[PDB]
From a paper:
Central to the purine metabolic pathway is inosine-5′-monophosphate dehydrogenase (IMPDH; EC 1.1.1.205), a rate-limiting enzyme catalyzing the NAD+-dependent oxidation of inosine-5′-monophosphate (IMP) to xanthosine 5′-monophosphate (XMP). Most of the IMPDHs share a conserved two-domain architecture consisting of a catalytic domain and a smaller regulatory cystathionine β-synthase (CBS) domain (also known as the Bateman module). The CBS domain serves as an allosteric regulatory module responding to the binding of nucleotide effectors. The enzyme is inhibited by both GTP and (p)ppGpp, which bind to the regulatory CBS domains and, via interactions with basic residues in hinge regions, lock the catalytic core domains in a compressed conformation.
Surprisingly, in our study, the addition of ATP under cryo-EM conditions failed to induce the extended conformation of the MsmIMPDH octamers. While the CBS domains in the apo form were not resolved at all, the CBS domains in the ATP-bound form established a defined position with respect to the catalytic core. The highly dynamic nature of these regions correlates with the drop we observed in the local resolution of the same regions and the absence of the CBS domain in the cryo-EM map in the apo form. We demonstrate that in the apo form of MsmIMPDH, the flap and finger loops, which are constituents of the active site of the catalytic domains, form a packed tetramer–tetramer interface, which brings the two tetramers close together. Thus, the two tetramers adopt predominantly a compressed inactive octameric conformation, that reduces the affinity for substrate IMP.
Residue numbers in the entry:
A (entry chain F), B (entry chain E), C (entry chain G), D (entry chain H), E (entry chain A): 12 to 109, 223 to 406, 427 to 440, 448 to 495
The structure:
Amino acid sequence: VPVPTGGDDPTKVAMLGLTFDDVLLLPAASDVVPATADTSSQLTKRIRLRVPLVSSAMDTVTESRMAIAMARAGGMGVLHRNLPVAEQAGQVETVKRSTEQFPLSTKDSDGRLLVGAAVGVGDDAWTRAMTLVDAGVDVLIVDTAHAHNRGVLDMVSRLKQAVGERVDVVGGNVATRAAAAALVEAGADAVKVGVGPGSICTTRVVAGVGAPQITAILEAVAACKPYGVPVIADGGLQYSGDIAKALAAGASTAMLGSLLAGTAESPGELIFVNGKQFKSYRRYFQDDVLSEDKLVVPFRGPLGTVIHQLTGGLRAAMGYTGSATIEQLQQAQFVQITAAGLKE
Amino acid sequence: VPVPTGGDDPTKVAMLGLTFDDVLLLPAASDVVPATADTSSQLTKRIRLRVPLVSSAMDTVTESRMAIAMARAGGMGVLHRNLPVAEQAGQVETVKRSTEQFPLSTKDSDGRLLVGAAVGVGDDAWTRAMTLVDAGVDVLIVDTAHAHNRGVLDMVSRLKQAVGERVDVVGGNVATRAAAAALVEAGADAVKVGVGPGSICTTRVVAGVGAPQITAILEAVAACKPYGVPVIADGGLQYSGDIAKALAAGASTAMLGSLLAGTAESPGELIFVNGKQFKSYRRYFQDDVLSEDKLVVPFRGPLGTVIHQLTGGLRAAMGYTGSATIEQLQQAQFVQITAAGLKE
Amino acid sequence: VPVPTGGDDPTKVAMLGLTFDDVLLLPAASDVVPATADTSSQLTKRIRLRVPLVSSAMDTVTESRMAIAMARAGGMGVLHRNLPVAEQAGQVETVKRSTEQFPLSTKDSDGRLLVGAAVGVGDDAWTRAMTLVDAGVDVLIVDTAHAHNRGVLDMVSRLKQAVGERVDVVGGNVATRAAAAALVEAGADAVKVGVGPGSICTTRVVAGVGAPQITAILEAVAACKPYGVPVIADGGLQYSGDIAKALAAGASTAMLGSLLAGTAESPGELIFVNGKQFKSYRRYFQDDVLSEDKLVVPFRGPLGTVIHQLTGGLRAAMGYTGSATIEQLQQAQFVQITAAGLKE
Amino acid sequence: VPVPTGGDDPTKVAMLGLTFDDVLLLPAASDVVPATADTSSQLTKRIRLRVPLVSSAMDTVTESRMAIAMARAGGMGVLHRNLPVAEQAGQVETVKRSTEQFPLSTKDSDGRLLVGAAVGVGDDAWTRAMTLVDAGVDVLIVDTAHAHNRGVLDMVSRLKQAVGERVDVVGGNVATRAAAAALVEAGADAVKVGVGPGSICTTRVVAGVGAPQITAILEAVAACKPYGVPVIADGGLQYSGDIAKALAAGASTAMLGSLLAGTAESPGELIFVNGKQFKSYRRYFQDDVLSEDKLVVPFRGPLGTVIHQLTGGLRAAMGYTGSATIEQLQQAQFVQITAAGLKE
Amino acid sequence: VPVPTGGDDPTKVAMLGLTFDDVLLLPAASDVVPATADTSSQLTKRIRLRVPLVSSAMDTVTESRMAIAMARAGGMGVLHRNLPVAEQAGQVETVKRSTEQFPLSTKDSDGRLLVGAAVGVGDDAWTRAMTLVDAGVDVLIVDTAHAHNRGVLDMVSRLKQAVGERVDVVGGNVATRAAAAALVEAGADAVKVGVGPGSICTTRVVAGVGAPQITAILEAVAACKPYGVPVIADGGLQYSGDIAKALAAGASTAMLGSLLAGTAESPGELIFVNGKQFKSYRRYFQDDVLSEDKLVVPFRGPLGTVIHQLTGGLRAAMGYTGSATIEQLQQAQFVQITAAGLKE
């Protein structure tokens, strides 16, 4: 009767959490070559990206330059909200205003580049969202550290009722089936997934709170797939294999954070120090209560090489799993590996 | 028929022991912000602390200054016993004798700072305990390396019969359900949990004896919660998130040991050597036969910063789990992580 | 109802994969000494080797010299295909053209040294295979990074129909029971097993695809043993005991890759740099789309010492397990070890 | 139906092997103080040692000096057999010929120190054994790397029939229940347990053969306890906690190897090199076919300190587990720990 | 005819420069114990200290607290000039306003603590100097990276005219006999010596300019001693013996810079980072063209320990050389040591 791990409640330790390093993609029957594989995926219920990648809403990752360069690559960028409302609307306008050079460009019905913008929760967040919709934005991301909150669901529902006909609303980070179901019910066109996905992330060390990303994606997909809501895996990625694992676990799009922090298209002036290069950037807008920043970059080259490497890894995984589309890749199986398979 | 780990007795390997690094706190539906979360918790059945932290009864950790500081920070200190009875009684009196500076101060009916003292087993222990009770102590920790002993149980019963109306008697270190049940039947007002909780501690290396702390807390709480007896988790803490994990496992209070040894309020002279700072302290009282000393410090800044960081991590965990109170956090669920989740 | 690792599909995580370091060979009742143990084993259904070792079809590993040495040591070499068809046919002829020095030599009906050659898929692959068959090759390895493909299966069937009477056709790398079953139904005379078997190999990092080698061997042998088709374990070997583990898991032969790259008989000029020795080698033929090269040596002494050490370890394992033959060793039992057993 | 680790045979991976680091001793009800605990144990069915330790039959560990010093400590030493028959008999005579200084001395019925001698298998081994029995030895150890052999059982039975009335015969190293049962049936008065117990021992790396020591002791005890045959754990020990774990797993005596290799009482001349000290020793007798030596010391101080430390660890473990005797210690339970509990 | 170092001009390489590590003080006939040695020495022609130590005018070294502590230690402080004039005057007033605690205190005619203030060159420097004189400063240091300049000389002359009767005008950094003679002719009451004195200082690396401190002190003293003008050695110090070497080389007082930067009395908030302590300080006034800043801190305990160590080393040197007074030490001899005397 007593639980082998202690106590009498078998649900106290609810589950065993698997991360990216715990699982591998099992090869399956394949008639797919990497070059012809279709990597297109649903970012929202109405928006299909040519590349299933989205740069994150970080002040070190996505601005108007990064958003434009990402849209021309076939993905999309989400403008961070650590800047004034007028400045964010101006960067939205910069992306919107700005043939063979960029064949994969993701464009709206007017031929203008698609762009996303992040919003918090509150009246300031509401006026920011209305300004960004007035500025011609296409996707509104109600992004927070812990989106299983009444305020976040209320904001998502308010946006979906007010500006839902024109733009698509995305709910912030979740890690459980219940949170994803709540976001789906509130009317989110997409659900962003991941709470403390990194092994030694500040959330795990300081708060003792976390959820391994593979299991979180599996639960959120179980919640969201019946209603057709796409799932965007955000965090815990270290190599191009992790993107393939996240998409095969059920997610529709991957959100790139620290992998794009130091690129040329990322914001910041490039400077030279001690034989190497870094980025320099010479709060009020940091209103997320559970954010990592409350609890407590080296130059990385052009965005094109990083995107090419990640897409090549994705295509190789699709070839190994025999997936002609991302939808078929979401049906791939996993094999769990032991600690002996982790040792270098 | 044979056990998969060897032999024919299925109880030879009683259970699988979880430590702090084995588990993470899952996010849940939350309407709680870390700032307004209440961290009040029971130390004993009668005493409540506004901050669930207690300093360990170690010579390097807790003297009158550390006890006073810990009581002023919202917790409590337990004065060590590696010293003559007169000195310990004088330290108790010093703490007892010594409104906008310390709002969270723990107090007794007379408004004086709450304090605790450790006692052993025996005649010298009995006279020490009686003198401490006369001196005005509030908690007597009958502390041993192994409290599942007839002598310790009899001492707990004798102190409960003699001074149970004045002071609260806390039983020493146990690691199983049966030992905690024995201490509860002995009349203890709280149970201190942990026996070789550290990974490579001396008790595990020299004697081969220990118990992982999460499982030990779960078993002790299974023994104590039906009777309302609080559990004090002692040992194994490395980060602020470990406090949240221990509280969620069922412990009501966490005892702070190695984390407080080098702080300013800890006893010892602060000296400067080789560009660093250390503490100096320029046996007849180490009478415990199973004590770690029988089997065989750097400066760490103010106590206030350590307490503030620990409480910030705990409040972040409460905001993540949707726990308005410590009792709600004790009902939070764990996710067990693999080895891959521990990789830096 | 939910899977303990996430979601609702119990087959999403298909199985737990064991690598070589996960298992050890249990001792058993033995009357066999290592010296008189017989290490003869089937390479294919028709070809038997006196030493169950084969050199990998890699440019850095196997050319005419390495093939000749491997055949003289009791095993066989497989000539790589990263070169024009004329060069590979000439190397096959060189091996074929070239009694107390080499008693264990593997031979054909005419007494010449047995040799193998790798072929791809396609028209150039077909003409390469036909020219190699004319040149006198004995084994054609239809080698790909992913043999669970219609093209590879059709190539195997075509080669079996065309040159099945003269040469033996070995299907390339598979990692599951279903792929091995498909290759067996395609008519393959042996199945090569392993897809990203290394812990941190490029296939696992860039593509997220792989399979632990012990489990992959077990599944492939479950597919092949009822039909008598031998399994060649390829990749993941680090020690001589790994050969014994792979053989006991059901593989009949182990292919030697990275262990043979730096040896004297391996191709390349032996040069001296910085007080050490290395090998030098002063693409149109790397046509495999899923090859490791698309996703992105030190000197090691004579081959004879490496082979002698490997065979000594294997013979010691056979003496420990009471295995007079390789077929008996394939029935040996494993003990699974924890992480603590891997600690240096 | 298919096995989750691969294949269709559920007994292919027979068991999960636990080592010393995998388990800890759970504290139990205790009325035992370390100083009064009885550490006496059965070395054989007729020989009870005052200290449950036996120095190993290694050329770097036990000679006449080490055997005498061990017998005076309350244990016993086993003379190694890597020396001439006449020399081993002479060292037996040296031990036999050579009040308050050594109260714990283990003596025969004549008051002479007890000593053990190792023998191989064969006619040379038989004449050596007869010489050693003629020399007044008390224990004959038929010691081999893999004692589950017809020759070893035949030698044990021959010795038990010929000289069984005077001396006690011990069977060599086993790791399974079947081997221990075979040794018991053949007539062994004690069974030595352990085959490749070390994590990175040569047997595991080279041969891929091994058995974690805790599970091996459990199985061998399950085989030997009903008939009253003592089990001697040999190998895998690194600290005094491991001796307690081995005895609590069911073994009656521990065999000390590398822990005593560099002591003063160990053979060899003490020399000074480069600011430290080592031992110097300025084959025909190495006839064990499966021995570690076939597959491929720093000074450690006085024996008394090492024996005192190991015995103190044992007594502390007995106090924690509440064992008044070694027989009661053999009833202690284990708790299994995860990888997170191994990290320093 | 040619110079052995190149060319035809023997004055191109003027002289060989000796640093502190090049020389050692030779023992001499002595009847002086360190305790009774007198360390009183001239700072300027009019002001005598009891300990010949002065804190440098750096914004990380000397503010009001450091100046007060230095004056109470028997020396004097020189306030940095990197701040508005009013703030520097306020610091001077704070020092001047602020009996057994500080027996060595340096005082003025009115019994207030002595203090110094740094001034630059120019009109703003003129008004700063006048305001500082009004505030009650005792020494004005006309400090520059290169004092052999007509502007610095004219500033010294103007200050010696206007406020020479009241304050002592100390000329800034020189490194040759000619510059020291120019400062003496300008009317400087003391001469500060050192220009790129450190081995790998920024002045030596970026500009290639410098002068070893022992030789520079010797030349400056050759210029100044015939006129009774004291020399302040400023830079190059690493150990307490360097102070004695500088004094014996002819300097009357040593200026303490980097050695006092991290002390408690130095300006800056003491912060705790990564288990250590550092200092924090949460340009228009850096108007010196040749200053080190134009060419391009850890905690150190109390000031008293550093002063005590330096004075103990100096007293030991005085006892070794037979120097009852600092002026006698200025007559001590040196032995030049080779590179072999520097090897650790």
